[PDB]
Design a protein around this ligand. Structure first.
Ligand SMILES: [Mg+2]
Ligand SMILES: [Zn+2]
Ligand SMILES: [Zn+2]
Lengths: 7, 63
């Protein structure tokens, strides 16, 4: 998946 | 994608269709069909999905 602003 | 607004600099801020509230700096995930972006909790996500897994939003997951 395409994710942003993860820890 | 229609859930996008701009700031004074011309930057874009995405709006989560699940809660109808803006990106607030917390983790988000993007639909692999329509490219709307959602806060993780608003689509039931606690940890990152498998990074290769396709993800689709609830509208695109309809059949
Ligand atoms: Mg942001
Ligand atoms: Zn949300
Ligand atoms: Zn979608």
């Amino acid at each position: 998946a395409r994710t942003k602003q993860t820890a | 994608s229609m859930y996008v607004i701009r700031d004074e600099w011309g930057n874009q801020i995405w709006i989560c269709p699940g809660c109808n509230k803006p990106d607030d700096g917390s983790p988000m995930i993007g639909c692999d069909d329509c490219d709307d972006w959602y806060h993780w909790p608003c689509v039931g996500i606690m940890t990152a999905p498998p990074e290769e897994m396709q993800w689709f939003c609830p509208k695109c997951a309809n059949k």
